[PDB]
Amino acid sequence: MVREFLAEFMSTYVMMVFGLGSVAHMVLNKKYGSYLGVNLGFGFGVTMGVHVAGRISGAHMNAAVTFANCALGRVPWRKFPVYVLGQFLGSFLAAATIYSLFYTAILHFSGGQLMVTGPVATAGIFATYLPDHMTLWRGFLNEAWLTGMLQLCLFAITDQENNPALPGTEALVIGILVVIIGVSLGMNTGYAINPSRDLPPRIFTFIAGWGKQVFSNGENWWWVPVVAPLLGAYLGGIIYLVFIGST
Amino acid sequence: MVREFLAEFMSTYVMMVFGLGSVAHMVLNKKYGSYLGVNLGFGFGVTMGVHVAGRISGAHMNAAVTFANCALGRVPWRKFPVYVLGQFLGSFLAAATIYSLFYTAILHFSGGQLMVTGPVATAGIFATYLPDHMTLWRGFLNEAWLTGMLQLCLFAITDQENNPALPGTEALVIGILVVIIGVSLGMNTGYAINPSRDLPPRIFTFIAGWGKQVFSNGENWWWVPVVAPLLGAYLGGIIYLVFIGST
Amino acid sequence: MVREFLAEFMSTYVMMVFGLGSVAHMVLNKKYGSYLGVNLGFGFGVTMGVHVAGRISGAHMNAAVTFANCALGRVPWRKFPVYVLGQFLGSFLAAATIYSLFYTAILHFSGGQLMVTGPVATAGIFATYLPDHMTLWRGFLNEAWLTGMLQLCLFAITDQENNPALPGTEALVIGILVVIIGVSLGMNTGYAINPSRDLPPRIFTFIAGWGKQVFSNGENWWWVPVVAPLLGAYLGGIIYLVFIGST
Amino acid sequence: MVREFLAEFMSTYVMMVFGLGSVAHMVLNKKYGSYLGVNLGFGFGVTMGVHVAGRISGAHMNAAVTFANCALGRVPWRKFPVYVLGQFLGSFLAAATIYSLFYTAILHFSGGQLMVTGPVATAGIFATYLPDHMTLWRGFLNEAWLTGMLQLCLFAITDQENNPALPGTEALVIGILVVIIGVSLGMNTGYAINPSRDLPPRIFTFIAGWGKQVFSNGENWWWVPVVAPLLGAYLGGIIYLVFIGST
Numbered sequence: 001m002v003r004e005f006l007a008e009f010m011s012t013y014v015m016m017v018f019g020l021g022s023v024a025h026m027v028l029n030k031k032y033g034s035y036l037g038v039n040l041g042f043g044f045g046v047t048m049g050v051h052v053a054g055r056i057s058g059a060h061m062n063a064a065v066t067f068a069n070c071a072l073g074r075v076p077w078r079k080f081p082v083y084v085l086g087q088f089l090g091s092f093l094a095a096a097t098i099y100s101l102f103y104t105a106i107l108h109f110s111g112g113q114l115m116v117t118g119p120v121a122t123a124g125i126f127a128t129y130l131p132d133h134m135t136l137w138r139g140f141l142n143e144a145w146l147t148g149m150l151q152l153c154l155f156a157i158t159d160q161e162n163n164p165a166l167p168g169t170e171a172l173v174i175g176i177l178v179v180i181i182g183v184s185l186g187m188n189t190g191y192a193i194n195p196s197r198d199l200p201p202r203i204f205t206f207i208a209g210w211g212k213q214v215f216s217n218g219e220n221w222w223w224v225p226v227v228a229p230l231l232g233a234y235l236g237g238i239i240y241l242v243f244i245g246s247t
Numbered sequence: 248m249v250r251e252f253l254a255e256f257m258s259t260y261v262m263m264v265f266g267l268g269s270v271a272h273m274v275l276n277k278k279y280g281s282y283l284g285v286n287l288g289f290g291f292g293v294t295m296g297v298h299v300a301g302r303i304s305g306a307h308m309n310a311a312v313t314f315a316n317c318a319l320g321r322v323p324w325r326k327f328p329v330y331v332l333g334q335f336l337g338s339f340l341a342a343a344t345i346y347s348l349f350y351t352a353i354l355h356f357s358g359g360q361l362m363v364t365g366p367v368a369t370a371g372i373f374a375t376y377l378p379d380h381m382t383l384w385r386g387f388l389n390e391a392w393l394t395g396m397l398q399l400c401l402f403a404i405t406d407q408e409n410n411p412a413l414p415g416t417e418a419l420v421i422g423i424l425v426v427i428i429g430v431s432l433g434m435n436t437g438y439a440i441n442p443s444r445d446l447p448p449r450i451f452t453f454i455a456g457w458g459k460q461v462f463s464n465g466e467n468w469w470w471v472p473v474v475a476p477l478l479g480a481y482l483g484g485i486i487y488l489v490f491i492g493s494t
Numbered sequence: 495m496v497r498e499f500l501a502e503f504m505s506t507y508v509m510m511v512f513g514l515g516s517v518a519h520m521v522l523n524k525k526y527g528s529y530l531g532v533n534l535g536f537g538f539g540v541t542m543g544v545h546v547a548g549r550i551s552g553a554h555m556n557a558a559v560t561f562a563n564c565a566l567g568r569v570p571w572r573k574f575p576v577y578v579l580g581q582f583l584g585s586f587l588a589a590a591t592i593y594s595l596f597y598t599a600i601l602h603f604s605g606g607q608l609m610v611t612g613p614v615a616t617a618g619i620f621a622t623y624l625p626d627h628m629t630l631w632r633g634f635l636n637e638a639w640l641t642g643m644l645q646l647c648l649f650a651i652t653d654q655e656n657n658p659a660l661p662g663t664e665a666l667v668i669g670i671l672v673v674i675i676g677v678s679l680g681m682n683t684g685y686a687i688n689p690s691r692d693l694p695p696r697i698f699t700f701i702a703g704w705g706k707q708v709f710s711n712g713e714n715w716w717w718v719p720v721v722a723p724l725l726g727a728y729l730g731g732i733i734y735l736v737f738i739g740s741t
Numbered sequence: 742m743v744r745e746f747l748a749e750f751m752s753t754y755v756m757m758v759f760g761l762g763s764v765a766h767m768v769l770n771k772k773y774g775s776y777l778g779v780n781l782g783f784g785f786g787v788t789m790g791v792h793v794a795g796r797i798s799g800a801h802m803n804a805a806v807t808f809a810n811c812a813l814g815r816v817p818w819r820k821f822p823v824y825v826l827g828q829f830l831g832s833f834l835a836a837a838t839i840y841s842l843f844y845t846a847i848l849h850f851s852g853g854q855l856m857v858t859g860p861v862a863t864a865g866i867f868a869t870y871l872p873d874h875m876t877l878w879r880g881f882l883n884e885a886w887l888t889g890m891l892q893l894c895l896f897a898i899t900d901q902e903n904n905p906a907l908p909g910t911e912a913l914v915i916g917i918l919v920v921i922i923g924v925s926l927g928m929n930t931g932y933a934i935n936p937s938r939d940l941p942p943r944i945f946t947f948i949a950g951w952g953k954q955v956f957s958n959g960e961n962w963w964w965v966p967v968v969a970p971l972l973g974a975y976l977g978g979i980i981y982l983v984f985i986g987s988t
Contacts, residue, residue: 003987006984010984014890014893017925017926018921019925022925029928032776033776033928035279035284036281036283036777040920048898048921051898051904051905052894053904056903056988059904101882104875104879105929107874133352134351135351138351141348145344149261149264152299153261153295156295156298157295157298162303163298163303163418165416166413166907167415168906169416171906172913173298173418173419176294179287180265180292183265183269183287183288184269184288185265187276187279187280187352188349188352243253243299246249247250247303282527283530380599380601381599385597392595396508399546400508403545403546404545409549409550410544410545410547410550410553411545412545412662412665423538424538427512427516427539430516430531431513431514432511434523435599493497494550529772529774530775627845628846629845632842635841635842639842647755647789650792650793651792657791657792657794657795657796657797657800657912659912660907661909663910667792667913671789673781673785674763674781674782674789677759677762677766678763678786679758679762679842680766681770737751737793740743741744
């Protein structure tokens with residue numbers, strides 16, 4: 001199963017470099033970054049990852065997507081740890097890549113202080129953090145529902161028995177899906193919708209010196225992007241299957 | 248006819264979550280929302296709905312589109328109430344979904360006051376409201392003409408006997424059409440162009456506590472996005488058919 | 495030849511409604527309009543026009559494109575007046591459509607004064623005007639070169655003997671071409687690149703009451719978007735053919 | 742080998758006119774230019790170049806892409822000088838084209854002073870310059886890694902034995918790749934990722950009167966966009982091949 005491991009590693013790495021890089025732009029310089037830039041970077045970063053691993057492993061790049069596909073009987077459970085290990089390694093090294101490419105920008109921006117959110121936050125470049133208007137319950141609800149939207153539309157785009165994207169263009173349409181999840185639903189939680197996108201870079205910032213607060217901030221927010229997308233992806237996939245089965 | 252009902256429900260729900268979510272971004276935070284974001288959210292939200300229901304029901308997601316297709320002899324009139332019921336239910340629940348996902352943002356933004364438009368409007372997240380420079384007559388004219396543009400281009404994109412989008416890519420091109428209706432024509436009325444997009448979320452805000460003024464504002468504006476698109480879609484479809492019939 | 499006349503009329507009308515509408519947004523409200531919006535509106539407005547008329551007339555929507563295709567021996571010269579008449583009529587009525595849809599916005603913006611450019615310009619919604627940093631010679635050079643870029647890339651996108659866009663997707667790629675002509679080259683002259691886009695709406699503003707200065711402004715700028723694109727399109731097409739002929 | 746020379750010349754010229762034009766917009770007028778505009782201009786400028794030369798020469802438009810393809814045994818080394826000469830000539834003349842089209846804008850902006858970066862920089866319209874927060878080592882690291890990302894994703898998009906873009910749409914997907922390299926990774930060095938994009942326009946500005954400092958600025962930055970992309974493209978291609986070979 002090293003084939004799927006390496007494909008999930010390579011695709012998740014590529015996707016996360018584009019994703020985290022666009023967030024670094026938005027955080028570090030308003031002249032060269034924006035929330036739309038983040039929407040595009042993660043969105044079409046997913047497109048590139050699909051071209052890398054789509055026909056080798058499926059290019060899940062997302063532990064919740066793998067969980068839903070295994071729990072729904074489309075991928076054997078033995079592949080779940082292989083996929084998630086590949087995703088976690090690729091996303092961790094993507095975080096390390098962005099940190100090194102943007103090192104001087106991060107240091108010039110923060111005055112040398114790796115801040116989680118003081119005068120100048122930088123931990124948010126790598127992982128999601130609850131805005132202060134949000135509660136942890138409503139953050140859980142958002143991450144679950146948004147990952148449900150992801151899984152349902154992922155199925156619709158690739159369902160060969162319904163109305164899929166023309167073969168050879170699914171990577172583009174999937175990318176657009178991730179773009180508008182950010183455009184339409186992302187301001188409330190940073191639309192992590194992906195345990196592999198959120199936890200490995202958070203672990204990196206802890207190792208890189210941002211401190212214990214990358215976990216405890218937002219009322220121990222760190223575990224929600226791990227658990228809520230798992231439930232959301234499964235529920236979104238269930239809803240699509242019940243929908244198609246009824247049609 | 249439950250097949251088409253469920254497909255219209257699911258596609259309209261998906262489209263409207265992406266649509267209303269992007270408007271919530273634009274209203275509630277200028278850092279994470281913009282009018283272009285709204286153009287993209289509704290536009291490619293339509294793309295996802297087409298993938299859901301396109302080959303089951305046609306993915307009308309729009310009572311005026313269904314009305315024009317029935318009035319032009321392409322869908323039997325018996326399906327009209329089934330389609331519209333599905334669209335209204337999906338769009339109503341999409342409004343309820345956005346309200347719950349953005350609940351704390353709406354409350355933090357408005358100070359707890361569900362305002363239609365006072366110091367901080369929020370009713371406009373869900374339904375269209377006439378800008379003060381507009382008259383109701385010119386608002387009717389806009390909604391009719393814009394829905395006519397929608398129906399004519401919808402026909403052109405999907406006309407297998409003319410120059411359609413390559414099969415398997417129509418969802419993308421249709422989405423782009425809805426993007427630029429917003430980009431080019433949307434500032435005058437909020438380009439409702441869709442009774443199912445406008446009335447069900449307006450009814451939701453009335454039930455949610457925004458009050459009677461969601462209907463009476465803009466000189467009883469509420470009925471125009473219901474009636475004007477019906478006429479516009481029919482006229483736009485008639486013009487395309489007369490155009491092709493003459494060629 | 496009424497087939498091609500009606501197709502050029504309908505496609506040019508559709509393209510110009512999307513085009514002029516996006517410029518009206520940019521002029522009249524900075525919250526709902528931008529230069530990128532104009533790039534997208536004209537660009538994907540062209541996409542919709544290609545779906546309307548692409549397989550009936552070729553969807554030239556542009557007198558310079560028709561001139562280059564006739565002068566290069568691809569369309570008989572007898573069709574040239576038929577195409578241009580259709581384009582001029584469609585674009586004129588598109589100008590009339592935008593004026594009526596945006597009438598109250600234009601009146602609220604200008605205080606009731608149809609200004610060419612005083613305190614609040616509105617004539618620029620419909621036709622191009624030289625920025626004050628520009629000379630008429632360099633404006634001629636821009637319109638010629640930009641229309642040359644258009645014609646050369648149009649040929650490359652549709653050349654079945656080279657590397658064309660996949661059939662059924664050319665409308666999208668052509669639209670993107672028009673998007674980036676605006677993004678990359680449009681600030682110097684408004685990238686008219688199209689006599690049918692520029693002169694008919696200029697004539698409309700003269701009839702609508704903007705006055706004689708729609709022609710005499712910019713050192714009699716009005717004739718350059720008519721003549722310079724004709725030369726540019728022909729030269730750009732010649733360069734592509736010499737390029738392919740040499741390969 | 743004049744076939745490939747002329748194709749590389751024409752495609753690089755087209756790509757660089759769109760690319761440099763969008764940067765001129767961003768530098769010279771904030772109303773009509775933006776960093777996203779630059780991302781789109783270079784990105785879909787690449788799309789047009791691929792349509793020009795994709796099936797004649799491969800539309801490398803990039804000396805590092807040609808170097809990696811020759812060093813990886815996909816193009817004979819005898820074609821390397823032919824490709825690079827064509828790219829350098831096309832990009833040089835594109836710089837000359839932008840300078841002449843934007844001449845009055847450059848003169849009005851700078852007050853007549855061709856400045857590299859004083860009160861009003863304009864040399865950055867044509868070539869990349871290190872931001873002051875950057876070191877030359879980290880600039881080398883960025884240009885190498887970003888060109889590696891380019892080459893790896895280029896291979897993935899066009900790999901007929903893996904999961905490529907549908908034939909006839911690769912130009913679009915490749916363009917999107919170049920868009921998001923700018924969106925996600927471009928603020929640190931201007932993502933030159935291309936010796937043919939950087940050195941010929943830099944040489945033009947030296948000849949045009951910007952002075953010796955176009956080379957010596959940024960601690961002799963000029964050579965890094967020449968050497969670092971060569972190494973990065975080769976390494977990115979090696980990584981993809983080792984990835985696929987292992988799968």
